[PDB]
Design a protein around this nucleic acid. Structure first.
Ligand SMILES: [Mg+2]
Ligand SMILES: [Mg+2]
Ligand SMILES: [Mg+2]
Ligand SMILES: [Mg+2]
Ligand SMILES: [Mg+2]
Ligand SMILES: [Mg+2]
Ligand SMILES: [Mg+2]
Ligand SMILES: [Mg+2]
Ligand SMILES: [Mg+2]
Ligand SMILES: [Mg+2]
Lengths: 159, 170, 50, 205, 293
RNA sequence: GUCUACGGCCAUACCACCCUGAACGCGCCCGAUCUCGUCUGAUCUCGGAAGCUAAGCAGGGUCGGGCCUGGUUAGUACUUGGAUGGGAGACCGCCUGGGAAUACCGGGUGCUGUAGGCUU
RNA sequence: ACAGAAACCUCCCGUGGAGCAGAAGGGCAAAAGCUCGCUUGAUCUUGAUUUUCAGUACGAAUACAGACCGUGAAAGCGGG
RNA sequence: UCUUGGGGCCGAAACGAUCUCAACCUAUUCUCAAACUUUAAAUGGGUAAGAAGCCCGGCUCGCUGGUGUGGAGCCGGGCG
């Protein structure tokens, strides 16, 4: 069997990328984390304090508590047939603001602007996204050039 | 016309007496250097234990001191006089320094005293130009740059002009 | 039937063999039909078929 | 002394080199990979034939040593001891183990090193011979005879590259004339239109 | 022959340090603990007082860190001191005190807190800390960023810090590093500190040199003579500078003037220029070879 | 055009060598009374202002190394899902989708925030 | 100088090719290493959390909160 | 290639000459890795895709604090 060691199997997971070792850039500590923020957890081997456990590496959760150095994150974890909402205390070196919602918050403002504007013009504008539709009919101009004929090439043993 | 800031000078003279063992001999050597330089020297311990040399790690075996300024020029003259202002070409390092050995310190005008004895010592001269200190400062350290370094030929050339010395071949 | 095919066939409402449905085509749906490729015959019906 | 080569024909295990974890591996049967006139310049031997594996299998170091002898002896007989240069292109790095029975049985069955093999892919060259153009038939026969020391299927193929270089023979002569190639013993160095211009001055002076 | 260590592989694997570290200007181990704010204080700024003494100047700044870079809230330079009557000795301890005082009064003036927190208008050179007044805006609080300086006793960064706290800024500190602290008895003599703040150590030197060697005096203090600064008047000179600094610490920026477009360094050569240069060099080489034969 | 203090990203910024640097800066630099520290005022600390861009530093250059980014490698290698496909096997082809990495070839060589200077 | 392959002194290059008690992996360069100065955050205390997990115990570990303290010029850092 | 060695080899003999084969260095070259790696897939694992949202005005705080600053909570209102 395997060991129950806390950091087993993190040889590559927690190591630093190639030629990106050494000092931690200080903008890592200047990020502002509020209650309700979505953050992606990514353990960093340079700082050994407040390390998330390996199972939380690559997961995204919500901030519920902010201390001087860490935050409390409610992150889902699947254990067999159930998913538990787990609360982990992670130092802010091992997290980053998630962009997963920014595309949504961009759309809301665009939605809220368009909804307001269209209303005062008495017009209807699409607000819901749609899946990419089938391409519509179009013309392809030859420009008096016959398409180049293609043929399969003969086999060649380039051994 | 050469820039005034390119003129060679003696950064320091470094005197070393590797007695090879601790005890009374080393302390006496510490007194020869103090007589010659007028400043208290410092003892250096053995990095490793070596059976053949009979030295144990962290054992004081040598004493040395650095001399700068006008005092370095004065003491260097005594040694170069004992050499008759003759040095070999191989005595110069490729980084622009040189040095020589003295077999008895009494030749340097140090009056013999019964309770000290006779010792030899090394002489090493570190040359330099102004602005060599950028590599030794804490804030905004730098490297002096290729054109400002001192070559073996420039060091030998300086020694001849400065002392009218002779660079023997080999 | 493998789990991922079993779910996609249930969303198309094709829970029985030789069941049929219309499916309006787009990126979302065309990629569902690719998962169930071995389990379905599909294509474009003409007006008479409808 | 050793098991028949059918017992280790296929690449069933991950590569198992001789390392600090696998210790006690006996020496491989094949220790020489180049024989003949190794020192011939690039231009003396323009022709190059290959023995190319048509299978994904393991070739034992004993088969590589035997084939090398078989191919080399023919070349000496038909082209002279200085008319060719042979290069075995496979090195037996994968170690094969043995679980030696006489009794525990299958308890603690992890085996000790027995030998070494080379893992060869489909289309991978096994050994190469370069010589003069007129010796084309003698290369093919030498490699045809060496196919009988190996298991599986091999193909003899006369390369379109010049000698042991990576450059086509139909343009190697021009590339040397234009100084894109510089003879460097058995091979050629490639000179790009890059780097210090003092290199260009040296070549063109 | 020995292996080239700085070969191609030594550069493929090489990782450069931070630019400010390469330059030898910023200590990132110290900076992290200086600028980084507690996460449960969010956007609350963490002000620090930067003191850098150059070879000829003293720069005092108040800054807080942001993700795009430090935002300087207020700056005071020692090259400004001639406006306040101090002409010479713009890197000595007395100047550092004035520069720190000017930085404090200028900030408090900007925030409108200069009347509330006047500091210690009469310089005593002793331990003093500004305490907030209830019902009034709180005292401005910053920390001393000493950079790479060796923070031994008498370092001029503590001269500027003393000038700032005596101006009304709240800066945690002890007297251990003011000139006047005795490492033997572990006692702080405020009267020694007050001497340095008024530059008497410099004044004593001028008298000492004048009575030792006139030639040395001229060599050491040529510009003090040119500006008619004598040892007797130095203490008053600095006391006036403190009053003037307090009277009007505002900075009037130098009015910018449009200039004729002038370029003082070469621009990059284009690809065509670089390419054509190689062609000319090649033609020149072959041409010389043909000429020789 | 550009610098100084403090920075963010952290080589498009590094490394090597060469050329040029107006003004202000930054420096080298000159000393050791004081503060302070050394075997040594070299460093550190302090007091200065005779000299110099020699150096650091800035800009530029090199069919430069590196680095960054494209092309080729290549719809190749590998790969999801399919067959009562082939083949004694080893393995391979096809169907439905995804899709690399060297060598080799080209291009580029810091951007920028706050505050404060210089530059008719 | 003695001094040699290896003693000590000096200059230069040096991305870590050393060291960090130990197995290995990760991490680390004005430091996490080496050397000094001062010290006992290896102290007292309630809860929360993580890891194994049944989401039990232990063990170990993580953020805090309250006291007392050390250190530093200070920001801070430290309850092995 | 002298920065070291073995063969030689002319000698009065030395780093003098002469070669010659190795170690060294520099560009190349064949072949590899479960306990190597600069690169780097496919398949895969989290999260988001609104009313528990958004946008306004105010109030509480013993927390934070140059600042009526910040943060949290609470109340009222408008948007389908
Ligand atoms: Mg240079
Ligand atoms: Mg197996
Ligand atoms: Mg510090
Ligand atoms: Mg000038
Ligand atoms: Mg000096
Ligand atoms: Mg110059
Ligand atoms: Mg290049
Ligand atoms: Mg630039
Ligand atoms: Mg330290
Ligand atoms: Mg506590």
């Amino acid at each position: 069997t395997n060991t129950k060691g806390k950091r087993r199997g993190t040889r590559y997971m927690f190591s630093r990328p190639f030629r990106k070792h050494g000092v931690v850039p200080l903008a890592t500590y200047m990020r502002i984390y509020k209650k309700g923020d979505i953050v992606d957890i990514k353990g960093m081997g340079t700082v050994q304090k407040g390390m998330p456990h390996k199972c939380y590496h690559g997961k995204t959760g919500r901030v519920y508590n902010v201390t001087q150095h860490a935050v409390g994150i409610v992150v889902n974890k699947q254990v067999k047939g159930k998913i538990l909402a787990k609360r982990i205390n992670v130092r802010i070196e091992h997290i980053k603001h998630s962009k997963s919602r920014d595309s949504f918050l961009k759309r809301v403002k665009e939605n809220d602007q368009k909804k307001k504007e269209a209303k005062e013009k008495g017009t209807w504008v699409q607000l819901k996204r749609q899946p990419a539709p089938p391409r519509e009919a179009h013309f392809v101009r030859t420009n008096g050039k016959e398409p180049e004929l293609l043929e399969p090439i003969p086999y060649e043993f380039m051994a | 016309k050469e820039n005034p800031m390119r003129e060679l000078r003696i950064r320091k003279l470094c005197l070393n007496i590797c007695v090879g063992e601790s005890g009374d001999r080393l302390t006496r050597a510490a007194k020869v250097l103090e007589q010659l330089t007028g400043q208290t020297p410092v003892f250096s311990k053995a990095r490793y234990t070596v059976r053949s040399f009979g030295i144990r790690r962290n054992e004081k075996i040598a004493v040395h001191c650095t001399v700068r300024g006008a005092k370095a020029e004065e003491i260097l003259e005594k040694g170069l006089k004992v050499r008759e202002y003759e040095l070999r070409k191989n005595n110069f390092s490729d980084t622009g320094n040189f040095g020589f050995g003295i077999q008895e310190h009494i030749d340097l005008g140090i009056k013999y005293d019964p309770s000290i004895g006779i010792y030899g010592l090394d002489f090493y001269v570190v040359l330099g130009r102004p602005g060599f200190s950028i590599a030794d400062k804490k804030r905004r350290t730098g490297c002096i740059g290729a054109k400002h370094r001192i070559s073996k030929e420039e060091a030998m050339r300086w020694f001849q002009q400065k002392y009218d010395g002779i660079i023997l071949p080999g | 039937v493998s789990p991922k095919v079993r779910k996609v066939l249930q969303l198309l409402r094709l829970r029985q063999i030789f069941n049929g449905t219309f499916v309006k085509l787009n990126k979302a749906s065309i990629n569902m039909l690719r998962i169930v490729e071995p389990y379905i015959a599909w294509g474009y019906p003409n007006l008479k078929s409808v | 002394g050793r098991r028949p080569a059918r017992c280790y024909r296929y690449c069933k295990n991950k590569p198992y080199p001789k390392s600090r974890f696998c210790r006690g591996v006996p020496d491989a049967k094949i220790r020489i990979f180049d024989l003949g006139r190794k020192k011939a310049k690039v231009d003396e031997f323009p022709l190059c034939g290959h023995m190319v594996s048509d299978e994904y299998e393991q070739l034992s170091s004993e088969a590589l040593e035997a084939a090398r002898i078989c191919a080399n002896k023919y070349m000496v007989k038909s082209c002279g001891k200085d008319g060719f240069h042979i290069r075995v292109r496979l090195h037996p790095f994968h170690v094969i183990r043995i679980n030696k029975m006489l009794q525990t049985g299958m308890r603690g069955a992890f085996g000790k090193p027995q030998g070494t093999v080379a893992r060869v892919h489909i289309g991978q060259v096994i050994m190469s011979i370069r010589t003069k153009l007129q010796n084309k038939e003698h290369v093919v026969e030498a490699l045809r005879r060496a196919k009988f020391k190996f298991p599986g299927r091999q193909k003899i193929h006369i390369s379109k590259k010049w000698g042991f270089t990576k450059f086509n023979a139909d343009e190697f002569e021009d590339m040397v004339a234009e100084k894109r190639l510089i003879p460097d013993g058995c091979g050629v160095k490639y000179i790009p239109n890059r780097g210090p211009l003092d290199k260009w001055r040296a070549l063109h002076s | 022959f020995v292996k080239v260590v700085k070969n191609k592989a030594y550069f493929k694997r090489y990782q450069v340090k931070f630019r400010r570290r390469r330059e030898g200007k910023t200590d990132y181990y110290a900076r992290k603990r200086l600028v980084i704010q507690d996460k449960n204080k969010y956007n609350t700024p963490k002000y620090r007082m930067i003191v850098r003494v150059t070879n000829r100047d003293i720069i005092c700044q108040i800054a807080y860190a942001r993700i795009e870079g430090d935002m300087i809230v207020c700056a005071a330079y020692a090259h400004e001191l001639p406006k306040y009557g101090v002409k010479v000795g713009l890197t000595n301890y007395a100047a550092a005190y004035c520069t720190g005082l000017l930085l404090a009064r200028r900030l408090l003036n900007r925030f409108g807190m200069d009347k509330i927190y006047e500091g210690q208008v009469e310089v005593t050179g002793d331990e003093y800390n500004v305490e907030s007044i209830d019902g009034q805006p709180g005292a401005f609080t910053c920390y001393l960023d000493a950079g790479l300086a060796r923070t031994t006793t008498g370092n001029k960064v503590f001269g500027a810090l003393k000038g700032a706290v005596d101006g009304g800024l709240s800066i945690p500190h002890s007297t251990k590093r003011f000139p006047g602290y005795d490492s033997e008895s572990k006692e702080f003599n405020a009267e020694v500190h007050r001497k340095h703040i008024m530059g008497q150590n410099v004044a004593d030197y001028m008298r000492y040199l004048m009575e030792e060697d006139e030639d040395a005096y001229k060599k050491q203090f040529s510009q003090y003579i040119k500006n008619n600064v004598t040892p007797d008047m130095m203490e008053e000179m600095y006391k006036k500078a403190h009053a003037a600094i307090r009277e009007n610490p505002v900075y009037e920026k130098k009015p910018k003037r449009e200039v004729k477009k002038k370029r003082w360094n070469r621009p990059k050569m284009s690809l065509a220029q670089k390419k054509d240069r190689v062609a000319q060099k090649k033609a020149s080489f072959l041409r010389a070879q043909e000429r020789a034969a």
